[PDB]
Design a protein around this ligand. Sequence first.
Ligand SMILES: [Fe+3]
Ligand SMILES: [Fe+3]
Ligand SMILES: [Fe+3]
Ligand SMILES: [Fe+3]
Ligand SMILES: [Fe+3]
Ligand SMILES: [Fe+3]
Ligand SMILES: [Mg+2]
Ligand SMILES: [Mg+2]
Ligand SMILES: [Mg+2]
Ligand SMILES: [Mg+2]
Ligand SMILES: [Mg+2]
Ligand SMILES: [Mg+2]
Ligand SMILES: [Mg+2]
Ligand SMILES: [Mg+2]
Lengths: 351, 350, 363, 364
Amino acid sequence: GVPAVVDCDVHAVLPSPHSLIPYLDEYWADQLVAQLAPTYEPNYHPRGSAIAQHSDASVDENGRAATTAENLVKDVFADGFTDFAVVNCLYGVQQIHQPRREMAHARALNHWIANEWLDKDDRLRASIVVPQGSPRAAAEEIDFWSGDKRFVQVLLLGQSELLYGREINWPIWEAAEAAGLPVTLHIGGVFRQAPTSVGWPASHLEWYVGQQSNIEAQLNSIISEGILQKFPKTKILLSELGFNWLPPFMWKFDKLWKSYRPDIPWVQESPLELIREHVRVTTSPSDGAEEAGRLDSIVDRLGSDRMLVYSSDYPHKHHSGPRDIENGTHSPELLDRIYRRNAFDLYNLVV
Amino acid sequence: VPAVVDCDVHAVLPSPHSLIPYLDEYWADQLVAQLAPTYEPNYHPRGSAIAQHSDASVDENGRAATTAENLVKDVFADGFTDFAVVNCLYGVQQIHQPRREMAHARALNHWIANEWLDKDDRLRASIVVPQGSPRAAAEEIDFWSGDKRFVQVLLLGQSELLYGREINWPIWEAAEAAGLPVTLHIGGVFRQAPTSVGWPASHLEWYVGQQSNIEAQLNSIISEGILQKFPKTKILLSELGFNWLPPFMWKFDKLWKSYRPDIPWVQESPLELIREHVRVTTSPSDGAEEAGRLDSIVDRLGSDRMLVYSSDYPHKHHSGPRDIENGTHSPELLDRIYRRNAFDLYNLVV
Amino acid sequence: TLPAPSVTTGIVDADIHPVPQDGALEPYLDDRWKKHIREYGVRTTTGLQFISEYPQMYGGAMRADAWPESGYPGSDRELLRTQLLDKHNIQLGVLQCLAPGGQTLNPAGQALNQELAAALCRATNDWQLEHLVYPDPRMRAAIPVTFETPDYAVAEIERVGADPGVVAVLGTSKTLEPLGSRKYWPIYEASVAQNLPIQFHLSQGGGHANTGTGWTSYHTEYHTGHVQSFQSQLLSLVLSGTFDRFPTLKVMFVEGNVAHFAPLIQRMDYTWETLRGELPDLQRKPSEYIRDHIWASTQPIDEPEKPEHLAELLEEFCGDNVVFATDYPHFDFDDPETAFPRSFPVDLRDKILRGNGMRFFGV
Amino acid sequence: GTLPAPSVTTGIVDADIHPVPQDGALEPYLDDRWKKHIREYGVRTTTGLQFISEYPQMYGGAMRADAWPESGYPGSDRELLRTQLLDKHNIQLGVLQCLAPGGQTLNPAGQALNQELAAALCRATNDWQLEHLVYPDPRMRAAIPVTFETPDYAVAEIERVGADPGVVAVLGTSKTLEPLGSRKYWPIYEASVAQNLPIQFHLSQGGGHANTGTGWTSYHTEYHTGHVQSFQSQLLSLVLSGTFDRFPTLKVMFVEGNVAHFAPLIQRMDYTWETLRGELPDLQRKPSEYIRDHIWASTQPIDEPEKPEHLAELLEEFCGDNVVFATDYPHFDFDDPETAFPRSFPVDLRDKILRGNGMRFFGV
Ligand SMILES: [Fe+3]
Ligand SMILES: [Fe+3]
Ligand SMILES: [Fe+3]
Ligand SMILES: [Fe+3]
Ligand SMILES: [Fe+3]
Ligand SMILES: [Fe+3]
Ligand SMILES: [Mg+2]
Ligand SMILES: [Mg+2]
Ligand SMILES: [Mg+2]
Ligand SMILES: [Mg+2]
Ligand SMILES: [Mg+2]
Ligand SMILES: [Mg+2]
Ligand SMILES: [Mg+2]
Ligand SMILES: [Mg+2]
């Protein structure tokens, strides 16, 4: 049994809200139609911008990539290198303020993934999309899918309404642990405050780059509030949020944990160790770590070769491509860990 | 015979050191080691004209309402008031550190129990709760539910999330189980701008404008279903005015008629739900004390059951606790305001 | 040269919502901004590509009977003329364009790229003057500008604000700072210089949650909640002394309701009687600013349980400062034939339908 | 006033020193109405708290336990500041950053919600620090707080005292209501450039938003580590907005935002821009190319990697010419110039951090 090559972040793109109708009860389906089916397509990867899709991705009748499992599977698995891919749908249910509709559309979205993606190719796995405006409802959604092992993780957005370590959000971590599932934070957000501590970014570019700051906040919250002692089997995947920012954050967090440990006395190990053991990160985008020697450098600065897991971020276009990380290292061993061994810790998938 | 209850008076914590006798060693020592930062709020700036009227007894630092002896002396002197409901606004809810918020809220309630309720059996009090953790807020309510001198739960007008959100349901559940009304009092956690259009630039602008947040809270509480889920719920609006209620009620009713299937559990009109479940203290009176204006506002509310007498001691308002009599010609209405309406909240007899 | 508006036998309608047909703004937008919109859309204070944070419920919140043969309600100028202007004898109908396309509420001024926002406001102003106002000058424009970038707003007021087809400057009820902030004073200065009053229309966005105490869940909360922003804005504009600095400035709150302003102002005075020492530079008692500076439009009309209370509250606000609007083509449109209670006084309604708006717009 | 330009000879630059006015020291410089206002209301800011900020300091006000004078708050005793800091470390250019009008750690005058009061407090602070500290001992020079959130008042204050040779920078806060590349702040940048003044932005609370982009923090580790986030966001806005295209001589320093994290932030910014630059087609340079001419960072509290060699690597990856020493006297995480750097740290880089780099920022 050899660990599989897992593409730890690819995307399904809902064509339109009408795709949810087969998986909605009459009350919600009729309502969606009567409301003229407003689309919660997010602005995290603006459909007309250069990040949205590779120019040569397979496309549907409207020119859009990744809206069908047939198209995604044709592209992702073509070259035979990838064994499994983890599908994250970013359709913006978490930005539905109406809490019953958030619950109903999140559920319908997961049904759409199950029936039109997971059922269509046994190499696909997926995150569970959850209604994070009600943490107890989010826990119920995790539980609803806990018997379908093709759902391999819980999806949370990088920007939340309250920090994920707050006790208000503990039901999510409890439910994920009870289901044996890692939790991923993926770039994106609920936008219930400014996306930064200094106000609203004026461009998509400024926003996208700067979401790394919110992930420092989330990790400090999760760790400081005690998630990793209260739910010690928790595993966290940072999807499509970079990773070169981690070491400077880790060093300062460690320095201040030494100064303030009595404020958080349950944290008895350095954040440095907790992050290396409980946090993994996807490799697309690589944010310059694909340049000569820089992947060896960042692994040295992380202090662990166990954290980086391969992804393509299909269909998104980044400055360097899925396998260009090979240019950043001289170690075949490190590449073997990134391509297959590190993700075994998350999903236990074998070739 | 229902008692004359002063439904909002204030205890003012002298300083955080007053909490030391009621904190575990870990928190008492940490307090002294922090140089005891005070969470005294700016809701009633101590040096401003609202903080205390010139007739109020004061302590060695010139502050009113920092001792039960001073408060009881002033509040009960004239024989009209039978009981008074004490709210301490010390800003534990603005403590971000969640365990400290819990510890200081619990200590504050102990201080109220020992240095106020134990000193005079005419005093009652609200339960201060750590609203940053609704689970822990529910436990604080449960803990004090045994002491029937605690007669309501204290929540601030501005919260972190709206009080009707499911995240907050444990508070409403615990208050209902304890048989306690929930009061919203002017004040806030200040975890966003106090208005939907940014930060007020003065205390005066802030103070006047907090009525807008109470419209938000009432709509959230009702629309989200609190009054069907917890049908014994009673809500007291303390020191938030009341003349703004009718225009809010009418628009809410009008839009409930338009959006009924969005909130199908709300089967009675918001008009009736507010008249039945919401009560409001009379200080400040915000102009309803002028000739005929109290009869008018009762006509506009559609109910004579909502207003409950308070003095808001020790605060100074433009008109005094009993000046409301100048706004009505009805002794029956004054009987409702001074005693009968608060019987629905506290069931206190003379 | 366009004649001045003339209101004789007909009425003022202070809030009408036209929408450009698809592509209608393109002749008025530089190619760079065309490209930007194609590639990014109009990003604002959401994480959503196409919709705002509270999308409309049934039918786009439009009148079911206001859909043209093709396009969105408000996008067909002939249907606007027959269903609104002719049907209600509107002789001054003030256009408030809330979206650059076939949508209900997505204001150009709220685009987070404020250079784009300025270009869309400019394009909207050229478009509404050429397509709607000049062909039928019963209509006149309230010009959207970028309140959050005063330099650009001032430039646009200088560019087109003197055009006789323009009767007001158009802002949004939600802003990043309360409207009495010095940030917005250059816009007030430029508006006064062009003899223009300002209308602030109900909006989402602004940069903060839609209440001062969290984001709303259900549509009752969202829609009733619109009143709150206007309460906050009135308090800031008055207490800041903005009208001491600009003693000729007129502002109208549009679609904030009316009656609630009366008890709010009453509380403002009563609180100020005690706390006035915080703001010793304010020249007048707070309620005294209303008569000369604050107007409000009527839609959606307040509906008290006892109808007599409407006239009472409108007068407690200021009976001379209340102005009729229909809100065509939104679902809660008010018909001037039926909006007022049976017992309402003719003189007050007449002022609301005619004189009051004529005074505000300088007609 | 008339004062020689600063001379850095064999001594060092200290980019962040926190003096505090003794009780009453600002009153000679305030109108009666503001003295009355402060007595009656205090200084209201973005909190619901009369006397403290939303995150009050954890241990002894976050001051080193040996910097307490006979009577006042640390930093309130000029003689003690001379012997404990300027004399002790041969500081020849020590830049004052007054963060509070009184003995109450971290409460910036510019953040008073009454911006007329804020302006008056900034002006009083500027008159006071020049009279009480700079002119008596011109080893010290002022970074003048101004009201960033009311540019008209800031421009007026920069015009009033900005040309005084006792002033070497304009002082802002890390947190603001809009990101610092916003056109709101451009009049301040214009006025600063006209006086040939760089701008320092010091770590702050407040600003109008939560202290992260995704909620308010709970524990002190989150709060203190979280301060870097605001600086990350400000760097992105200042660069990507083209602020430095509009003001090509403008120099900005992030004070007490740490240093090393800027390197991978900038690296991710370039990498993202390579794909998405079409959104912002006017920007004249690749984003990282703005750093050398426009962005500085002070060292305190020094980054402490697990392998010390990574420090110099990350400082050079940011920009080795643009890192400037600071002590943060008298705060508890004070850095000593003799011990702040790892034993193996390159001597040439250390020398320019202590001297040349700050001289170039401050125009010496
Ligand atoms: Fe991704
Ligand atoms: Fe009170
Ligand atoms: Fe409208
Ligand atoms: Fe409308
Ligand atoms: Fe400092
Ligand atoms: Fe410091
Ligand atoms: Mg089905
Ligand atoms: Mg390719
Ligand atoms: Mg260690
Ligand atoms: Mg008696
Ligand atoms: Mg004109
Ligand atoms: Mg003034
Ligand atoms: Mg005066
Ligand atoms: Mg100079």
